[model samples]
Target chain A: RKKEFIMAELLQTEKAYVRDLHECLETYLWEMTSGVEEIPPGILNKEHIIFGNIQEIYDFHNNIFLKELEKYEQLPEDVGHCFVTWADKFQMYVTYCKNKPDSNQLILEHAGTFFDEIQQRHGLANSISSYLIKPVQRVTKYQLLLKELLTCCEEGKGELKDGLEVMLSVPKKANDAMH
Target chain B: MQAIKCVVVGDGAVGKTCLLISYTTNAFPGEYIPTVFDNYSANVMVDGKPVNLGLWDTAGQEDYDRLRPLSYPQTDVFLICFSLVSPASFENVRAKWYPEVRHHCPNTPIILVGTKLDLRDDKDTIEKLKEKKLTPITYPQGLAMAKEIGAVKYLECSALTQRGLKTVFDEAIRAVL
Candidate 1:
């Protein structure tokens, strides 16, 4: 089924917004990880299965990811990597947000990075603007993505409140720097 | 098959690079960052016909007087840019810019562009500008100037909004043909 698409206004300039960007990010991640769960266990010849798993998702539930977690009680850097991928998905969404056909790309690029930053309690609006938003806004399609991502982050949705705590913490002096 | 060389002339801080980027790259920078006296020529296709534009941008300061003559020769087009906020810059187009353009590229396609319409100044800002005796031109001022110059076109552009690129390019294409 085709996912419903929503047009997001990512560049309100004065407002802190991000709902659309979040949705855009989520959609892209789902599409990118499309077949990760379906790799049948032991179906491939031993080497091909090992190679395919290693090449793609790398570590799944039972062995490396699970053993490491059982031993340390902490998420692996690889899991954190998923967040980065998710965030970058949204980046693509915002960059092409205005261009329609590829507006979803902004969402896809930003998905990994944004989601990871949110969980780590590290990314904020101004920070995102400087590192991600500012550069994309320089281009037409990408500016749309930035505008949408900001809008999505500001709406105080499910994960947004926690995400926004980080935003509010950024010092006022640093908020608008070099922008 | 030869490229048409054009020059973009304006005072410093008048949004020449902003206009150039918006027109050529189809994009605008986030804020009004000033440009140095930089010049660039780009290849842009108009109506599916490939064309080259040579842009010569000059500093608004008098120290850059040498650049004025450098921009004029072998130029097919001359664009004089001024700011809606600065009448002094506009005045200089008559007192200085246009004359320099004429000296170097006489009878070239001369275009006058007033940049920066996105600025929504408050009454305080307007009064301050008025104190400087700046008569801000409405769109009509641009049309009148174009007529005065026997120009094929006149444009009051906001480099921020990309309001006049197609019109300007259309005029340039016609001139080249």
Candidate 2:
């Protein structure tokens, strides 16, 4: 099946120009899940099919993020598009990873690893420009927040992220421990 | 003490509300118009100890998409419920349900619950689990997932029977207090 052309159109309708960060974020989500549902189907009805397709798609989408980052590495000109692009990807990753375990591991691992690389790249770019990229390409608090949250979940042996653990702990302890 | 607030989400009629009511009241609340969002707070004794659980029951209708994110502000848990009879509902928990919850409540614990154990033939749910070729999801599978997401507990429970319900409730208390 062509997979519901209406759905395709719906998904493809990311707002034009995405002039600002929030608009871009909103557009990314609208497109991803639009035209996404083939039928009037909901989760209550289609668990297995829903699980498989959605997981595969989510994983695939994140892979695209990494791929784009690789491209940005090769060509410095992609810088303007890079931050916004990866931010979009990270947004999707965090969004997809929620309330689900297997997906969460994938997102946290990818986000943390990706963040490490992105921050390093930002530093390199800053040095090249003789200007601090820290202000422009700073590490996203959203990604950091999510990565830490997932890590805490792992350590707690199957529990939600500890608010106390996140808020009360000193800053130095945030990423100090590793599994 | 600090309590974790979680919301039960899944497709309408997947026993999302039923399970929450069962957990809170030990009685099932039958089919009712699912509002876009609703909240419930209760205290249950777990491991012979009392703990507070603040739960939000979300209406899983597609048009009500924003409700999940709206609930995220205070949420600490995302209890993804599915019915044994419907393999699709189970899938939706991981797919639509979990992803949305992730975007809204990034670090919330994701509990995989197979509600309605009392309503369905246990053998049938088991048979579906084995033959369904779906993702591997047992009680242990849930526990393992919980660990991965930093969940205090993962469970496959029957709200109606109160089976495994105590453990879930007890763990909630431990995590919150």
Candidate 3:
């Protein structure tokens, strides 16, 4: 009863974070990065400043990170094991968060009628800003989620507690870097 | 790695959760997470062999006091905690904890712990305790309680500043050993 529902939420939200990550890299950043007459629109090509290391984060989460999350299917408590093991890799998120203010400013100053049309597409319910800030939102979420996970199951745990400690400081690290 | 089950118990607001969270996270988590600290584990070298340290935090509120013992079966060690700043909580370790824990799992070793060391001689805390005609618990007094109850060991810590914090877990692992 304990750790199941919340671990379920962690997995699903992780999926969402990854899915949104793919949307930005493949669609939003992709269309912007094309050069060889791929699309007739003006390119939104400030990829370095605007997108930053998001591609690396996306590639990792979508590729290997989600795999380990699935590895804990039978033992949900060790899902946190998935987290802390890769804790250092999460600095990719820190880089993205630090550049976010610049990203938002760039989008506000630029992004023409073509980008406006992309935002209206039926599948894209949120703007690029919403997607861009998610890494900022997602990093701080694990501490609360793991704190709840920490209380469940009156039995033994795996990396669950170690993961909480790792996640607890993520916000501190994130906020400090961003500020 | 082998797993060692350890449980923590003490009266409410006695800094029980703070001690666990602070130790687990290495920083005093800011707010109260109210009742039932999450299960915890750490991989540590206890006596040169890797061990999985299982930590379970229980609420000592009156409503669930009867229900808390369900977690005690098969536990290797217990940490009985009280706040040095609160005299009633110190007495409770004897009045409530010693009798209840031994009745359930009489053989398991327990580490008597005094919490909030930073507040023991704190100016504001001392003034408040004095108003109630009480004083902060001293190290000598805590050791006496441990001796009286035959506690495996006695230690004190502050979840706030993290003084003497790491020793509590090391002692818990040693008691298990």
Candidate 4:
């Protein structure tokens, strides 16, 4: 049942991760994306650079990726193929790492105080960057999940292997870019 | 939106992290995304109202006795947990956890939680506990302790299965409301 259990873990985190993405979207990014008229003046100028393609990443995860992962979860042996099939779309994240520093810089330089006020108003658990970093965290997170997944579904691991290099590099570059 | 300080106190390794993790985010344990409970804080939707629930996972060891109360001052509620399978852990609530909480923050509602109920009723687990002269806590034992301590609620939960886990927190927030 540990195997069945680990499979449940992957789906649960995927669900939770999507919700966190939605929280970041609703709390921070949506305000800017909706219109710049209401944002604090400093962030209003640079919301695009600070948020990057995160809205797209959230859209893919919320609309497409999580929906597909639900289907593959019915038979996890096929999830590896499910992973690689979508490998092409993960380019959305490369730009996430690409723009993360500017994102962090803008927050730190211009509106850390402004961000804090929003978090307090919404009773959020963490800052906007805390939610942003999960896209990076999920990449490293998948490596750990898939390593455990192979134990339950040996066939799935081989199918999943083709995409591991791409998965591994995102976090490595997330660190490189973050630093 | 009001922030409810729900500080968790009990013996270390008595499933403090698991209980809070199981409630806050029900997915993975501690593999990653640890800030949910590493900071021991979260925001939850209680009865359609958002609550900033600060869960202070204080150290149970003697080393932190002096420092732990710094977190105790603002807590609206406290969950005193002990493994149902460990009697000393169970008894510590009487001699240890209860005294500590009341001394520092009197009149604050305390929820007495009997943890690891799955193990309490397990055959092999009882044998393991019996070898060490440790007996599993009974529901009556928990109720009696709950009565004695004037705890707002007496509850038992197996965080592994998440059975009875949700109510422990639901009642905790309710106590504050």
**Measured with DockQ on alpha carbons, how good is candidate 2?**
0.01
Off by over 4 Å in 2: A1-179, B1-3, B29-38, B46-50, B60-63, B119-152
Local accuracy of candidate 1 as per-residue lDDT tens digits, B1-177: 445666677676577756776776676755433232234445667778877555544333233343234234446776777787777777777777777777656778776777775542546657887787765666787677667656666666677777766577667666766
DockQ winner: 4
Q: Quote the positional error of residue A161 for candidate 3 in Å.
A: 33
Which stretches of model 3 miss by more than 4 angstroms? Answer: A1-179, B31-36, B60-62
lDDT of 2 by residue, A1-179 (tens): 11122212212221111122223223322322454422222222333322223333335434453345345333322222443433333332223223233323333343233323433543321111111111111121222222333432334422223322332232212122212
Ranked by TM-score, top first: 4, 3, 1, 2
lDDT of 2 by residue, B72-145 (tens): 54456666766655667756655677677777667665556666556554665566666866533445545554
Off by over 4 Å in 1: A1-179, B31-39, B60-62, B120-125
DockQ of each: 0.03, 0.01, 0.01, 0.04
Docking class of 4: incorrect
What lDDT does the true structure give each of the candidates? 0.44, 0.42, 0.73, 0.72
| Candidate 1 Cα deviation (angstroms), residue B91 | 1.4
Q: Per-residue CA lDDT of candidate 4, range A1-179, in tens?
A: 55556567777878888888888888787666676436666787687888788788888888888888788766666566766778767766667766766676677777747766778888777656557656655654665555556666665357666655566555555545433
TM-score of each: 0.45, 0.40, 0.50, 0.51
Docking quality level of the chain pair in candidate 2: incorrect
Candidate 1 lDDT over residue span A2-41, tens digit each: 0001111112221121332333233423323454333223
Identify the leading candidate in terms of lDDT: 3
Q: Indicate the DockQ of the complex predicted as candidate 3.
A: 0.01
Write one digit per residue (lDDT tens) for candidate 3, span B18-100.
Answer: 78888888998764343324456678776687887877666433233433443566679999999889899899888998998
